[PDB]
Structure formats: C-alpha cells, structure tokens
Structure 1
Amino acid sequence: NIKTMIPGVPQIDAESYILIDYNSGKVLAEQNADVRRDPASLTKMMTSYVIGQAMKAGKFKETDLVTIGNDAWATGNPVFKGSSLMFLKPGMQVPVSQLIRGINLQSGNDACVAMADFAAGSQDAFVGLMNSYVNALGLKNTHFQTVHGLDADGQYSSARDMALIGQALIRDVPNEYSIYKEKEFTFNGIRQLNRNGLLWDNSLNVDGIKTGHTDKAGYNLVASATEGQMRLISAVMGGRTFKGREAESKKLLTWGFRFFETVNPLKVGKEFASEPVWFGDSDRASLGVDKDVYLTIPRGRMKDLKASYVLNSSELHAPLQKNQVVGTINFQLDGKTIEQRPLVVLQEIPEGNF
C-alpha cells in the first residue's frame, strides 16, 4: 500500500494551477488548467520567447543599441498608466541587454514596444510572431493581441499553456531563460529588483519564471525549480491573495519533489533491442528511440521499473530508414504499463549489395 500509494494533492488557493515535469512533460497535478484566463504580465513570457528566438537566429546581439521611438515613450502613452515601466524616452539608445532585462526582470511594458519594433518592425507584426509560436507549440487556449498584455480585451491563456510557454523558454531559448534568475539589474541610476521573490527562497532552487497581477486576473506566477536531475514547472493563475502568490506555488513544487522523481532510462542512439532483418547488408537491426526518454515516476521506485517492447510486423524487411518506427517500448511499474515510447531503427539498413 505504501509502494503503490498515490499522494494526495494539497489545497491550492488559486483559480487554476498545473505542475509539470520539464523533461518528461508529465502532469503531476492540475486544476482547471485549460480554462481561459487573463494572463496579465505572463504575456511577456511570449514576448521574451520571440526575442530569444530572434537572438538565437543571430538577428541581433545583447550589445546592439535600440533607439527608442514615440510608441515606447513611457510618459507619452497613457496606456502605460499604473504599469511597470523602464521610463524610456524617444531617441534614447539602449543596449538590447538592458531592454530585455527590463522585460524579464521588471516586466517594463515600454521596453516591450521598443523590442517589438526592433525585432519585428512593428508591434502588430511582433504579435503575429507571438501567435505563430502559439500555433507551433500547439497551445489550444492562448491568444495574444498586444506585445505587453495591456490593452488586450481578447488576449488569453491558461495554466497549462503558460507552463508550456515556460518549458519552451527553458528548452528552446536557454540564454534567454537564464536571465530570469538574475535578482537585480540597473537602468539609469536606479537599481531594479526582480519581482519573482521565490528566487530568494533558500529552501528551493528557483530560477524562473514570471510573476503577474491585475484586479481582473488576480495573482499569477509561473515558477521553475531544480533538484539535481529534476526540474519542475508550476503555473498558478488567479492567486486569490497577496503573499499566497509565492506560497501556493512553493507548496506545489515541494510536493512534486517529495513525491516524484524523473528518470532517464534510455538516450537516443543507445541500443534497447535487436531484431533479425531480411534482405539487408546486416543480419540484425539495432532498435531504440529517436529522443531521450524521461519518465516521471513515484519517488524511490526506479528499482521496480521494467521495460519491454512490442513489434508492429512479424518481420523486418530492408530497406529500413533511420528512425523508422517498428514498434513500441512499454515501461511498466507493478505490472501495469505507465509510459510508452516508439521503437525505432537506430541506423539505416539498405538492401543487401554484393
């Protein structure tokens, strides 16, 4: 009963939450995780993601100077009233490094317009890109309308999608992601503190991601944390109270690390299985995966993990292409299959030539 226990999830005082394993993508806990909600400042995670995808493609550098236009003039645009700001003025020339820190650390909305026109030529075009990446990551409950998330009556996202946005940030744009852990940065003689106060929590290894609050939206946080071979990501949306912002998230992460652990049973290219092949330049095919397998399993249960496979066809016939799917690897715990991955041919086997 102890071996096969399922941990109860704690009460979370928020309208929605999810908790995923970053490597495996396993959902450990969820409530209302697809309901569409105002993402407030969590919108700047996608802003960040586009920018980081542009810098990864070499379009521009941290040291490049961005010239501030009228549209990014903090006190020239009452849409910015009450919101986090760098206090950019036109004709300023700010390094990219300083503007993307404004966005990330500070959620400065003025810095969002500066960076959108710089990377994409207009805000409208940049939002084009934001929604393109919403399509490419396969999010079913997310839509953006503005670069900052202000003035967007018809923008939305969800706990799940915002978690998946964090996974993508981490996975796809790691130099962009590694800015979120920075506790402070300085612009124009003022020091600016990162608003993610879980960074200062000495029990966990928090290094991201994004905080957010409006009266309509409540308190939002997307956090990520590590414990050696394990990274978790939580999205809490509509946090109902102040301070509970960080606390409810801390609950979820701590719980996930106490009750679960992530394992890597098999990496790309490593032979899991071997089967006879007909008509080849070799008598046998090497079978494995085309992508490292990460599984989230109850903590401590690595020793009981079993793996077996099934095959689609009675016989393999050459030519076999690289990463041709020939079957399925089953990972089992207590005699029940918990996870499945495709079985693929690791190395091409063309028809025999003599």
Structure 2
Amino acid sequence: LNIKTMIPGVPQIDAESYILIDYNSGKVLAEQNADVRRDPASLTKMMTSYVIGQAMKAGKFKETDLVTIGNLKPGMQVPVSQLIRDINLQSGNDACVAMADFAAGSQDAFVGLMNSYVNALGLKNTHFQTVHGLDADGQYSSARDMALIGQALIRDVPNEYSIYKEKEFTFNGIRQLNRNGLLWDNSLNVDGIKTGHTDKAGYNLVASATEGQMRLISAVMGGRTFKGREAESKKLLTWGFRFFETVNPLKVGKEFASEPVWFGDSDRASLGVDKDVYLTIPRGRMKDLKASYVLNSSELHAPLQKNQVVGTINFQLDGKTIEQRPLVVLQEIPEGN
C-alpha cells in the first residue's frame, strides 16, 4: 500500500561517515559508519565552545569581561565576546588557549572539563587532548558523537549556539567572516555549526537547519573532495526534510486522558506525560498517527503522587506502535478516606 508505507532510499554521500538526526526526537534518519573513530580536527572547537558556554551560563564570566593574552600578541586585553567569536566563526587557535586559561586556570584543566562533559553527554567514542585539536594526532570522535555535541550546544547553551549564525564579526577593526559557507545558501535555513579540514581528517561539517518547527542535525566526516564540502551535507538535510516530519503530539502538563480514582480526595485523575512527546515520521502521515493508552491496574486507587506512572501511551502508525511513553498522574490525589 506501497506509496504510503514506502521507505525512501538514502542519497549517495561522498564521505567516509555521516549521520542525520532530528534535534527534538533524537531519531536517526540516515547513518553510515557513524560510530567509527576519526579525527575531528577543528570540530574539537565545538566541545571547547560548549565548555565556555556552560561557564557563561553559570555566571563565571561575561562577554564584556577582558582577557589578558599570555604565553594576538601577549599582554593585550581582549573582550570575551571577541575571543569566542574568533573561536566560533573562525576557529582561531590563539583564542582557544587564551580562553582555556581564563576559564580553567590552565589548558590541561580545560581539557579535563572537555572530557568530563564527554562522559556527561554519554559519548562513547570521543576523547580530547587539547583545546584546539591542531595535533593531527591522537584525539578522536565519530559522526554520531559530533552530532550529539551539536545537539547539546543547541539545547544546553542557546546563548553560545546563537553566535554560530553570525556571518561576520570584527577582530580589532579587522573584519572576519564565519567560515561556514552554508550560512549564505538561500535554499536552506542553516544556522550552524562547524566546518574543518585536515588532509588526513578530510572535509568535516556539523550543520543544523530548520524548516517549520523541525530541526535537523547532520554530521559528515572524512568528506573526500573540495566541491562536496557543502553540497554533500546540503543533500542530506534536504533529503531529511523532504521525506520526514517531526510532530509533537503531547506536551507536558496537558491532560491526555482522565480516569476515575477510588478512595481519594477527588474522583478523577488527570493523566499525561512528564516529558514532551516528539516523534519523527514519514512526511505527510500525521493524520494517520493514532495514540491510545493502557493502564496497569483496572481501578486507580488513591493515593497517587504527582508524576506517578499508571500506564503507557502507545503511538501507532499502520498498526505499528512506533513509540511508547509512561502515562503519569499530573496532579496529586491524597487518599480521602
């Protein structure tokens, strides 16, 4: 029933590894060697910028604060806004060392923070050695881990992430461009990430684009040619938006169902979810998306705690449950008698 339930063929991507994920759902739309350990090269500055965003989020320093350059010439004073624009748009290696020392006291302690953020994110194939990644040796990542770093940037530090769409900034009366060529592509709404090239790392790009409420993240690593620098990723984004859509069937705190309660201070339980429901399904099939729920006991008896789990919501497509979520009590019901 062949055109409704059709599974699209993934385009040909000329690179060694790639992954395409939906920012909200976390769904994996396409993947090839996504867990293979490779050199991220200057994609390493994504994690560097993540750690800086977290420090600014926590109030440790601000954009208007002044940084002294040490061992861009030594002893000049540069605002944080400039140094992080240099890191984010230009990938400047100087600015990474000046910021690591400002923020963490030394490079090594900063590297120590990079790698604990790797474990906090759950990344299983990334490890850093320097703040900048210049050393063609020894440090590694994967297309999957790099896209997950991209997502955490957008999610955890939105004030850091908003800097990556700036097209230009002025280092000292010197106008500097963002190096991410996809920002000027009028066919897409790209607002991110990082570009990097090393003869052994190949061409690498972590991009993010939006269409409607939908956000996609791609990571292509070890791209083989100059002319596919931007084009390969643009293929993959475009493909993902053409065949898929992300819908949001249920938000936190909304009443999904209502069920009778025995023995409490009220006779009805307001039921829902404790986390937002985002799903990624084949474009155009929403009106076929059905939701239903099953309870774990026949009668809901009091007491009920707020966010207690009393069942499961089953999201279905073609008689296929594509996702299940815990159904929770949205408002506490103390035992009445």
Contact 2:90–2:177 (CA<8 Å) still a contact in 1? yes
Residue-by-residue CA offset, 1:247-299 (whole Å, 9 max, x unaligned): 10000000011001111111000011222333321212211111111111111
Aligned counterpart in structure 2 of residue 106 of structure 1, from 90, 96, 111: 90
Residue-by-residue CA offset, 1:60-92 (whole Å, 9 max, x unaligned): 11110011111xxxxxxxxxxxxxxxxxx1111
- Give how far 1:325 is off: 2.0
Contact 2:39–2:136 (CA<8 Å) still a contact in 1? no
* TM-score, normalising length: structure 1: 0.92
SS in 2 for 1:330: strand
What residue number does 1:142 align with? 126
Residue-by-residue CA offset, 1:198-255 (whole Å, 9 max, x unaligned): 0010110011000011122111000000111111000000001112011100000000
* Deviation larger for 194-203 or 121-130: 121-130
Contact 1:102–1:111 (CA<8 Å) still a contact in 2? yes
Unmatched segments (≥5 aa) in structure 2: none
- Give how far 1:327 is off: 1.9
Contact 1:319–1:349 (CA<8 Å) still a contact in 2? yes
% identical equivalent positions = 100
What residue number does 2:105 align with? 121
* TM-score, normalising length: structure 2: 0.96
SS in 2 for 1:14: coil
Contact 2:166–2:178 (CA<8 Å) still a contact in 1? yes
- Give how far 1:347 is off: 1.5
Contact 2:41–2:136 (CA<8 Å) still a contact in 1? no
For residues 136 and 15 of structure 2, the distance between their equivalents in structure 1, rounded to whole angstroms, comes to 23
Contact 1:146–1:152 (CA<8 Å) still a contact in 2? no
Contact 1:271–1:288 (CA<8 Å) still a contact in 2? yes
Contact 1:322–1:348 (CA<8 Å) still a contact in 2? yes
Contact 2:196–2:205 (CA<8 Å) still a contact in 1? yes
SS in 1 for 2:321: strand
For residues 310 and 92 of structure 1, the distance between their equivalents in structure 2, rounded to whole angstroms, comes to 65
For residues 164 and 136 of structure 1, the distance between their equivalents in structure 2, rounded to whole angstroms, comes to 12
- Give how far 1:154 is off: 3.1
Shift in alpha-carbon separation, 1:122–1:271, aligned structure 2, 3 A: same
- Give how far 1:152 is off: 6.7
Unmatched segments (≥5 aa) in structure 1: 71-88
- Give how far 1:301 is off: 0.8
For residues 265 and 139 of structure 2, the distance between their equivalents in structure 1, rounded to whole angstroms, comes to 57
CA RMSD of aligned residues (A): 1.3
Structure 2 counterparts to residues 303-318 of structure 1, below 5 A: 303-318=287-302
Contact 1:289–1:342 (CA<8 Å) still a contact in 2? yes
Contact 2:296–2:311 (CA<8 Å) still a contact in 1? yes
- Give how far 1:169 is off: 0.6
* Deviation larger for 199-208 or 142-151: 142-151
Residue-by-residue CA offset, 1:128-186 (whole Å, 9 max, x unaligned): 11111111111111111111112373321111111011111111111110100011111
* Deviation larger for 188-197 or 19-28: 188-197
For residues 301 and 24 of structure 2, the distance between their equivalents in structure 1, rounded to whole angstroms, comes to 34
Contact 1:66–1:95 (CA<8 Å) still a contact in 2? yes
For residues 193 and 6 of structure 1, the distance between their equivalents in structure 2, rounded to whole angstroms, comes to 40
For residues 167 and 104 of structure 1, the distance between their equivalents in structure 2, rounded to whole angstroms, comes to 16
SS in 2 for 1:130: helix
Contact 2:203–2:225 (CA<8 Å) still a contact in 1? yes
* Deviation larger for 25-34 or 180-189: 180-189
Contact 1:274–1:285 (CA<8 Å) still a contact in 2? yes
For residues 203 and 314 of structure 1, the distance between their equivalents in structure 2, rounded to whole angstroms, comes to 54
Contact 1:145–1:152 (CA<8 Å) still a contact in 2? no
For residues 136 and 336 of structure 2, the distance between their equivalents in structure 1, rounded to whole angstroms, comes to 62
